[PDB]
Symmetry: D3
Subunit: 160 residues, 6 copies
């Protein structure tokens, strides 16, 4: 069906939970666009360029992933990427309720973009980019939760 899926988010930084979801998406769809939202208003730890480079390196082993950045309305960027599948990761109820609101909003903005929720391994079901950054800024060991390239970049960013 030459299916194109988009997996959007801030990925600040991309975690093993995100790698898990994008890997599951590549096994299901022909082409996956991992889309990184700039979102400067949220004051990200890494620049958009840094996040794109980290995600490209962390997904280099998957042949059907394309990493790109965007500052647009996500649904407009998905239409412009010719995506018909919108990948979401399902971890907690609080995330699920907010994802339900976003999916109904995205369906009003682009009805042909089908929201699909994938479930990560139990190993990453309790992690987030925010939680990993919080632990790391207090010098806690987060090597288990991030791709090697990302872990070294996070340590460097926090070292000033």
């Amino acid at each position: 069906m030459q299916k194109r899926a988009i997996y959007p988010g801030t990925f600040d930084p991309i975690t093993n939970g995100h790698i898990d979801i994008v890997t599951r998406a590549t096994q299901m769809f022909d082409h996956v666009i991992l889309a990184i939202a700039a979102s400067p208003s949220k004051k990200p730890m890494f620049t958009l360029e840094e996040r794109v480079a980290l995600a490209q390196q962390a997904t280099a082993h998957l042949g059907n992933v394309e990493v790109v950045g965007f500052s647009d309305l996500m649904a407009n960027f998905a239409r412009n990427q010719h995506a018909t599948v919108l990948i979401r990761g399902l971890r907690a109820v609080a995330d699920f309720e907010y994802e339900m609101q976003l999916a109904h909003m995205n369906r009003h903005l682009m009805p042909e973009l089908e929201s699909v929720f994938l479930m990560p391994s139990k190993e990453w079901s309790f992690i987030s980019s925010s939680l990993v950054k919080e632990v790391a800024r207090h010098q806690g060991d987060v090597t288990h939760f991030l791709p090697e390239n990302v872990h070294q970049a996070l340590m460097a960013k926090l070292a000033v």
Copy 2:
């Protein structure tokens, strides 16, 4: 029973979800005070005066609605408006849990002010003022979710 109900919130800006709730309240109670909290600390998109004017225009077709602004403790403002009914809208679990805490707190502050939860149409069960503003600031079409006067005011506010 000459019942007076208060429907408080930031209404920044008032949405079709809020119009739905206030319409249901006017069919049940003799007089409904739609109470707009100034809350400058939360940095609202619209000034309190702008929110009051938008809500007055959006509820002008309902004869038993009175739009007012407040900066007081909500329960003190409700007592001062002679309200005995406190209208809340019920959409998601995250909102419900926080509304439960506020209702127990409001009952300690003013036990005769009865919290009543009304449920909006399925059409507005996944929207919020925050979500509409987020979509609009990324140029997404939010005409369906707001009264006409509000939609034009929101576009003007974002146009700088």
Copy 3:
């Protein structure tokens, strides 16, 4: 106003949580119909005649409560009773989810019947007729959760 409200359920048996909710309803509506479903509850410990007599005695002090048995679809009975307000009690998240489904269904069946959710005192926010029956059947003290007449009828029921 001259609002007619209906508060339906199995009330098997009526608890202090139900008395709390029906009391709050009588403070805001002119007439409250406490509607007892003829259908068996998940138990069903008390017969309809027992449930009606217990509810009548336990609400006798409330001048604007009418206790009535019904066997139809609740909305069909609410319609024939000219009720325009449907009282529901909200204790927790599990309650909320199921009550939201029922409220959207009741609105489809009878749109002129408005669902209103009231919150009981913290005192009764963790009880149900089911829990009370399980504890009492297993020789636990439930005196605090019931009107005196219900406590007497429950002891009589468990003795035989």
Copy 4:
């Protein structure tokens, strides 16, 4: 791709919510197996032969749907059918919790079967086969929630 997806359940009876989910699945996968469990549902109102015939007629317009009965563990049937995608529908939080448990269990049983959660239209986000049956058995109108053939079979079933 040539992806084979399975959408299992009791479908007792198949509703407009199930038609919505199976339609979305046919738009993203080459072949969709709508798998009907031989096991009784919490009711079980319609026999397996009735459930299959109703689902076949209600999905006849979808060229890539195959309606099939099964009695094994769902994952055992998905495995023998060479399905690599497992379609689930997500309506609310109560659904989510139980579906998460089942998805982790299905991944343990058949890791090559990827669980995918789709969201139905807001129109069907508050219905289930169970709720439809309870309303219809109690003389309530459920026409809007069902395909025409199912509505006809349900009236015939309740008449006898």
Copy 5:
């Protein structure tokens, strides 16, 4: 300290999730009573004598565990056993809601019994005795979720 803790349930059958919770309890309290309810579970697959023998063998390596059958209200048995700590396991939101209701009820029945909630490993955070039984009865592999003796008894039970 000399704290006596009680960990009650049907344990039909005892799983690796229950072993995980009882092990954590033995690491913090001097004596742990693993209390098996004589009452049938939603199934009830194993008889009380089978449930006790299985739990005894599966906890034999833990020196401070005492496996005991009971038929009374749990709090009545905890009281007579001089337990001051009541062990509960928390896996998900559905568990949490019901456990909160039970904990407030147990505190009313026996205030000197303190409810303590422990979290199992992520490995067992999505299993229950009910789910294990449904999968095994339908010819699914549940070996990973059970102690070896329980796995052997379950195969023997399903064979006849």
Copy 6:
């Protein structure tokens, strides 16, 4: 078992809900460290020194409580305090979901630190330090929710 428990948080300011939890912990464990996180990035109302002094005065009647401040990773501070028990308070689902993520993270950081959740009285099940501060800054009466010393300090802080 000479058990040492740590009860960490921002306690900005310590409430009657926190006093309830720490009192339950002192009845179960030999020594309880009430650990106050500095967290200057969150812009606390009270300085770390003020929070420590308020908590010491509010827990002076409990002989086995030690109040200390920390700016470290919480798990490292717990190891350095020789704690093997981590006290958490369980009020709402939103808190529970976040507490589940923190407990799995804390278990990866310090597996021998056992997270234990205690449930406060129904009286404090709907309060938080944030909610009390919000009500107080709008001049609402919060005397019921705080120890006397804390209430007077909060009034003084808000009086400028």
